[PDB]
Structure formats: C-alpha cells, structure tokens
Amino acid sequence: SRPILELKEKIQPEILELIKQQRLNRLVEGTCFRKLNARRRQDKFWYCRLSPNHKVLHYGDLEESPQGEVPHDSLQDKLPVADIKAVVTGKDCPHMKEKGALKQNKEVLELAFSILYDSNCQLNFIAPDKHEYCIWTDGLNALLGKDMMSDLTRNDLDTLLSMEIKLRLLDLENIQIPDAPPPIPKEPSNYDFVYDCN
Amino acid sequence: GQGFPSFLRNKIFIYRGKEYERREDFSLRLLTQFPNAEKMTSTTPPGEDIKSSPKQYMQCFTVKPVMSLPPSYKDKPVPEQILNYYRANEVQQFRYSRPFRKGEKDPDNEFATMWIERTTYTTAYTFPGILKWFEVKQISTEEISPLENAIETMELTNERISNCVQQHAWDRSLSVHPLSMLLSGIVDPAVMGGFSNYEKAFFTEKYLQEHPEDQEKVELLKRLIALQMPLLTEGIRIHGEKLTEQLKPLHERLSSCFRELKEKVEKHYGVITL
Amino acid sequence: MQAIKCVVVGDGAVAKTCLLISYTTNAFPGEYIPTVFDNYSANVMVDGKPVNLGLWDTAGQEDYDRLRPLSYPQTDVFLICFSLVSPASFENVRAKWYPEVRHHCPNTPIILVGTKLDLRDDKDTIEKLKEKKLTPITYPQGLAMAKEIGAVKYLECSALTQRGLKTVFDEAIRAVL
C-alpha cells in the first residue's frame, strides 16, 4: 500500500478542514460549561456560545440549565478572538496551583482550561469529561489556527481518511499501482490537435 | 470604506441607544452587526483614502441631544417633568464638542487654548422614529472661543445648580448627597481654581490687549457669575435646611467660603450683585 | 432608585480627575473636556437597576488632610488610587494614603486601582524611569499590596485607553452590591 499510502496521506487537508469546521459548529452550539468551585449557590452550569460569525463568545454566570445553551445576551457577549494568547491546560492553569479556597482537586486536572486575555485576566473553566474538554481545546486552537488535541480527532482523521480512500480504489480494482510510477510517454511538441478542442 | 452596502458606504448615522448605553457597549453591539470590526481613532474627520478604500471603517461616539422647542412653553413656569421628557424625545438636532489647543500651552493653565469646534447634526426625521437610528442629513461645524467656553460652562453650571435645588425643593424624602456633591465641587475648585483661571485668562488686562474690543464678553462673564452668587445663596440655605452633623463642618466651610466669594466678586472682581 | 457615595484620592501628579471626568462624560479617549469644579457625579446601571452615583474628587496634597476626612463619614465605598508608573506614588500610598485611609474608615469596602496602564509598558517611559532610577512597577507587587490590605478588588486601568475603566467602576458599584 506504499503508493496507496502516499496517495492517501498526500491528499490530506480536506478532512482536516472538515474536522475543524465541525469543531467550530460544536463550539457554536456549545453547552452549559462548568465554573470553578461552584458549590455554594453558584451556577456551575453556564453556556458559552460562539458567534455564528465566530468572533464573539456569549458566556457568563448563566443558571443551572439542564437543556444547555440558551440564545440571548449572556453576562458577557464578547471574548476577543483577535488577541487570545493561549489556553492553559492541566497544571499550567494557576487555579490548579491554588492552595486555598479554590483548590481544584486532582480529579479535574484534565478538566482545567483558562483563556488568556487582557494579559492579566483568565477564564478558569471545567469540562464535564475529557472528550468535550479536548473538543473545546480543538475549537479554540482552530480559532488559533493550529493542530487539534483530541484522541477522538485523530480517530476521526484516520477512520474517515480510510473510508474516502477505500472508495477511491474501485476504479483500479484487480489492477495495481506501480510504486515506481509508469514512465511518461513523450508528448509531441506540436499542439495542432487535428480534431477540434472540447 | 467601500465594502459597506451602498446606503452605508461613506455614510453617517445617529443611533437612539438604550437608556444606559455606555459608549463601548453600543460599539460592541455594532461590531456584532459587522465583520471588519475595526475602530477609527481620528473621531472627528473622515479618511479620504477610506472614502474609497475597501475594508469598511467605522467610528462611534456619544453626541448631545440638542434641546427641542416645546411650543407654547417658552416662559410658563412649567414643572421639570415635561422638560425632561423633551430632553431626549422629539429631537432632531445633535451637537458634539471638539476639544482643541489654540495658543500657548502654559503649564498652570489650559483655558488659554480651549477652542471647541462643536459639530451640529441634523437628520431628516425626529427621534424617536420608526427606526432606532437615522442617517444624518446635514452636518455643521462651529467655533468657540475660550471666553465663550467660559461663558457656556458658567451658565450650564448655574442651571445645573438651579435644577438640583428645584428638584430637591419639590420632594422632601430626597438624598442630600447631591447637595454635598455640588456644593463641595463648586465651593472648592480644589484641583484647579476655575475662578482665578477666568481672572488670569480674561479679567487680566493682557487679554484686553489680545481682546480690547472683545471685552464686551468678559463683562458677560461678570454678569453671569453675578447671577451665580444668589443661586449659591439659595444653595447654602437649602443645605442648611438639609444640613446634618457630618455636613456641619462641611456646611460651615461652604458658608464661610461662600461669603468670602461674595465679598470677592463684589469688590475683588468688582462685579455688582442683584 | 438610589445613589452611592464614593471617594477618590491620590497624588496630584497623576490627574485622576481626568479619568473621572472622561468616564462621566462618556467621551472619546483623550477627548474629555476638563471643567473647573470637582466632585463629579453620574447615573449608571450595573445590575438589576440603575443607580445614582457621586464621585468625591479630593485633592491629594498633604495640607487638605484636615478637610478631606470630614467627607469620609457614611461613604459606601472608597477608591484608593495611584500611578502604576510612579514609585513615589507607591511610597505615598503604602506610607501615607493607605494608612490614614484605613485609620479614618477602618470599615469600608476598598479597591486599589492602577493608572497609566499603557505607560506601564511604555518603552520610552520605562527607559526614562531606569535612567531616573525609578521602577515601572508591575502588577504582582500591586497584587501583593492589595493582599496586604485585602481590598475587595484591585484593578489597573488607563485614561488614554479607558481599558477596564468601565470594569473598574462596575466592580466599584457592585462592591456594595
């Protein structure tokens, strides 16, 4: 499958952009995200909806809505997508290093993500589980315009690339691809097509 | 810009924002309305390059709702409520003051250079309307001399004091903190003494060399502060009516400085009271 | 409907009045028109309901320490102020402003606020401070001072940019709320 593998991974980007566009859709539909230490009458659930334009984020201390995202003007309808330095994931979150009242336990080490903005403000949030944590980081990095960080993302890449290529080898069925490509027959220099064009 | 729609490119509109739109909140809302959300910084003048360039450029700022003309209301001692309604509604004129430095930037003083290039805006229709916004119809600039600015500042201060005095004179269960607010701020121009600032700016004979024929305005300043002092008197008496023990040192300071300024204007400024 | 008392002090070399008047005017940045009188007021909603507001513009030099505290009584919040780019302001506040403020009103929600937030990273200003042997003091030690008081908040803003300035005042109002 050496010619097959070359031809397969060589036409990569379409699945990549499809994955990322889906991630953007997932961010837009969003969910009621999770806050820090929302124990005493603090709304742990709260939606963070990406703009359909994907430039602003509708988020804030929204209520405990089990249905999820509600379309309206959230507590803060802006997150500046043009200046976010990064998102800190895991131990890099300072709130994980908190040793006082906001001690995020070791059971949320993989659920910690904070948006870097204003160079002094952070958005220390929690994910309900790993897969959506990685999904949100994926969507953010897509806004950041870089690679993805979900195991499920690699899963999707491999499975769908295999599906597409497996569909393509139907014309060459019972035929083989010489890993050394066939030599190009020489083209006569004249372009005087005796029969008409088109 | 040019990417704006046909009726939007190189256009200017006036928006009837919400009751408490801080400027940048409304700016954020407008950016939500648009891609290419970049904000210009030469707020007053347009950009000729951008009068044709793509990449839609915008700019937003609050403007002053110029008072309407309540008909058959010009002199009758009508209560405020109808006027406060007329402050914002049924309006078509809108102005915006333009700070400008004109003259020497001497350190202790700025009122030697202030020249306001106010910008009056007239739109075809009258807020409120079918649309929460409207395109400006005619644009007009203005020019204001430091004498003039001193004037307008002075009266608008006077009417503000009158307004607070009357609004508290009709309702008794009313906070006295605004009275402290004003009475303090006027009594001690602590950060910079506005009165002496007028004196150096215009009352000095130097200005009467820059403005010999234009001394018919410094006398207007004199008459306007002259009408100010009795308003300060009603302010002092109103405070005394609403005075408390914490305000007692405050009130005595106000009263002492008030009669000080009284004698000063009568003789030191030489202005004749009524 | 209601109003809130809120005092502001600080050394006169920072022109806090410029910030206050720019905010109340809602003007363009760097386009405020300075009046002649102090003690500004405004009427803003922060959450739920709009509130009236009154800002005590207090002169900051040492002499008026006899008249300034008489306005302190029954002030809902006070806003202590400085210049982020003035180590001398830090000396004055940690040494004079903050101590006497805590003395006069040991019972008041307090927020420390920076100023010239842009000039904290102004390279020419920073090099001037270095050649004048002053420090363009950064956030973390300001945070340390805030913890030293344990103020209900500490923020940094600028007048030429008004950044966080609305956040400053919303935090100030919600301090009572």
From Swiss-Prot, chain A:
Tissue specificity statement from the Swiss-Prot or TrEMBL entry: Widely expressed, with a higher expression in the spleen and placenta.
Superkingdom as given in the UniProt entry: Eukaryota
Function: Involved in cytoskeletal rearrangements required for phagocytosis of apoptotic cells and cell motility. Acts in association with DOCK1 and CRK. Was initially proposed to be required in complex with DOCK1 to activate Rac Rho small GTPases. May enhance the guanine nucleotide exchange factor (GEF) activity of DOCK1.
Subcellular location: Cytoplasm; Cell membrane
Residue range from the parent sequence: 530 to 727 of 727
Assembly and oligomerization: Interacts with ADGRB1. Interacts directly with the SH3-domain of DOCK1 via its SH3-binding site. Part of a complex with DOCK1 and RAC1. Part of a complex with DOCK1 and CRK isoform CRK-II. Interacts with PLEKHG6. Interacts with HCK (via SH3 domain). Interacts with ADGRB3. Interacts with DOCK5.
Short sequence motif named SH3-binding, residue ranges: 178-185
The protein's name: Engulfment and cell motility protein 1
Positions of modified residues (Phosphotyrosine): Y191
Domain PH intervals: 26-147
PTM text: Phosphorylated by HCK.
Swiss-Prot record, chain B:
Subcellular location, record wording: Cytoplasm; Cell membrane; Cell projection, Podosome
Signal peptide: none
Domain DOCKER: 1-274
Coiled coil: none
Family (UniProt): Belongs to the DOCK family.
SUBUNIT field: Interacts with CRK and CRKL. Interacts (via N-terminus) with tensin TNS3 (via N-terminus); the interaction increases DOCK5 guanine nucleotide exchange activity towards Rac. Interacts with ELMO1.
Described function: Guanine nucleotide exchange factor (GEF) for Rho and Rac. GEF proteins activate small GTPases by exchanging bound GDP for free GTP. Along with DOCK1, mediates CRK/CRKL regulation of epithelial and endothelial cell spreading and migration on type IV collagen.
Domain statement: The DOCKER domain may mediate some GEF activity.
Name the UniProt record assigns to this protein: Dedicator of cytokinesis protein 5
Organism, scientific name: Homo sapiens
Organism placement in taxonomy: Eukaryota, Metazoa, Chordata, Craniata, Vertebrata
Gene responsible for this protein: DOCK5
UniProtKB/Swiss-Prot annotation, chain C:
EC main group: hydrolase
Glycosylated residues in this chain: Y32, T35
One Pfam family in the UniProt entry: Ras
Covalent crosslink: Glycyl lysine isopeptide (Lys-Gly) (interchain with G-Cter in ubiquitin): K147, K166
Annotated motif Effector region, positions: 32-40
Related illness: Intellectual developmental disorder, autosomal dominant 48: A disorder characterized by significantly below average general intellectual functioning associated with impairments in adaptive behavior and manifested during the developmental period. MRD48 patients manifest global developmental delay and moderate to severe intellectual disability.
Protein name: Ras-related C3 botulinum toxin substrate 1
